[PDB]
Design a protein around this ligand. Structure first.
Ligand code: HEM
Ligand SMILES: [Ca+2]
Ligand SMILES: [Ca+2]
Length: 306
């Protein structure tokens, strides 16, 4: 079983080294905290949190970095390399990349103003990467609520609270115009914008993402506090200001009878949201981990030990 004290003897300063690395990177890249949290999410949804997403291509298996949900989107890999090297220097062959990324995600959330907690540890690193599984398991912004629920249940998260709380990760970070073009100009082949998108915000988004414009242009997930980890994400949903389809469906989908009350509860209380986020984060971090002697303690997160 995973435990928060796993490295209290072998590498007591691991969390501090991770924090220091992120603090330093944030000065030149204010988006890195969001990027790191997302890497952990994409790691856990594919064969569990086993650092499989960090592996680069080999002639025997393809990298998950080329998955539809990661390609030209996932980022921060060199930063993970930096903290890994620092931890390896402080504590040789001790901290797995899987655990490192989990701590990095928690520290990223805390540094951005979110809750502070000690994540369960003891995960080990995968011996391969899973591109096909990543293409099948990572949810997409155009998913309906039933599809979002299916995606979470598929990896082991059955609770609507899991889905609603973890979606709160969109309280910060960036999103490409590419992913909302349909909502802005032609939703579900209706030739009209998504009716669940606030019409005033629709105008603003159309200005940032004009038709035939730069699809790679970036827009903030949270128009209220773009880089702060808080519950504003839910207040936006209540006003039909969720940025992507999957965000707004939590509040507007015909199948949202169970998610609406959660959205409201999280928008009404920061404490309720933070508590739910920590709970959901630990549940996600507990998805099919390799433990004990299974897998390895990867020295270079990009390659399997030889
Ligand atoms: C519920 C289904 C979800 C969908 C469909 C989804 C979809 C997306 C999309 C389309 C982007 C934009 C990528 C880009 O434009 O390059 C993104 C970014 C992001 N997502 Fe999600 N996401 C989901 C859940 C989550 C969860 C569970 C977390 C973490 C707890 C998370 C954290 C983030 C963060 C922080 C960013 C910004 C990353 C950055 O700016 O580098 N997402 N997501
Ligand atoms: Ca994984
Ligand atoms: Ca925010």
């Amino acid at each position: 079983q995973l435990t928060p004290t796993f490295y209290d003897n072998s590498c007591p300063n691991v969390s501090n080294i991770v924090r220091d690395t992120i603090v330093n990177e944030l000065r030149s890249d204010p988006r890195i905290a969001a990027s790191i949290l997302r890497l952990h999410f994409h790691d856990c949804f594919v064969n569990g949190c086993d650092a499989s997403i960090l592996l680069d291509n080999t002639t025997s298996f393809r990298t998950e970095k080329d998955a539809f949900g990661n390609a030209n989107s996932a980022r921060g890999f060199p930063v993970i390399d930096r903290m890994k090297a620092a931890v390896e220097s402080a504590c040789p062959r001790t901290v797995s990349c899987a655990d490192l990324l989990t701590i990095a995600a928690q520290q990223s959330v805390t540094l951005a103003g979110g809750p502070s907690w000690r994540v369960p540890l003891g995960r080990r690193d995968s011996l391969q990467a899973f591109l096909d599984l990543a293409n099948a398991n990572l949810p997409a912004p155009f998913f309906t609520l039933p599809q979002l629920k299916d995606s979470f249940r598929n990896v082991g998260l059955n609770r609507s609270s899991d889905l609603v709380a973890l979606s709160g990760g969109h309280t910060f970070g960036k999103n490409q115009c590419r992913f909302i073009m349909d909502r802005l100009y032609n939703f579900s082949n209706t030739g009209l914008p998504d009716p669940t998108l606030n019409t005033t915000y629709l105008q603003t988004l159309r200005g940032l993402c004009p038709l035939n414009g730069n699809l790679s242009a970036l827009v903030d997930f949270d128009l209220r506090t773009p880089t702060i980890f808080d519950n504003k994400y839910y207040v936006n949903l209540e006003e039909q200001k969720g940025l992507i389809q999957s965000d707004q469906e939590l509040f507007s989908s015909p199948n949202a009878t169970d998610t609406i009350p959660l959205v409201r509860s999280f928008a009404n209380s920061t404490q309720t949201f933070f508590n739910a986020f920590v709970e959901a984060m630990d549940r996600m971090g507990n998805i099919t981990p390799l433990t004990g002697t299974q897998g390895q303690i990867r020295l270079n997160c990009r390659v399997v030990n030889s």
